[PDB]
Amino acid sequence: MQIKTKGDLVRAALRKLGVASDATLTDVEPQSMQDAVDDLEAMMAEWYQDGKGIITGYVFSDDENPPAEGDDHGLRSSAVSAVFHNLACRIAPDYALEATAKIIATAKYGKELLYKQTAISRAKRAPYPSRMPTGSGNSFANLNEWHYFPGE
């Protein structure tokens, strides 16, 4: 993918918004880039609720590294569009703008696709209760005295 860094994500978001692109002769303002990167980090930390939220493979920049921009975001190839569409939606009010209906729809669709596989993975069935017998058809268990399921 040609979108390998947090700055690539931010530039894509600004282009989606039509703030700093080549279709319109505008350069990304260095004051805008840091604000957008901070918004991206805040939104990513919000999504990834310490592991119990949306898992995307994004890498959070520590305080040690000087540039928060320039580092690979670590996303998968199928998360880039979702991330930068949501980022454009989030940072549009910075400039008193409003992301258009297509951008909002793509943000919704992308976030749902982000969570789909994790939802399938977390759709797990709880074991049998501790008070449920094994039945006499489970001959080995009911011979070795495992008449009931453990549970938990």
């Binding site: 080995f140 268990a141 070795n144 495992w146």
Partner: protein
Amino acid sequence: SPTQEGWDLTDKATGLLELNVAVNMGEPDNDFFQLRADDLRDETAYRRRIQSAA
């Protein structure tokens, strides 16, 4: 038994001595293994694992 031949055997009376051997034991030889229900491969394997252990 020692044995001497002669007629005057004064001050030459032997004592007695019986030797012995010691027999002791080593350490147990186990076949510790772990049995899992809910496998259907540890259900048929255990019945034959006991015999292989013997």
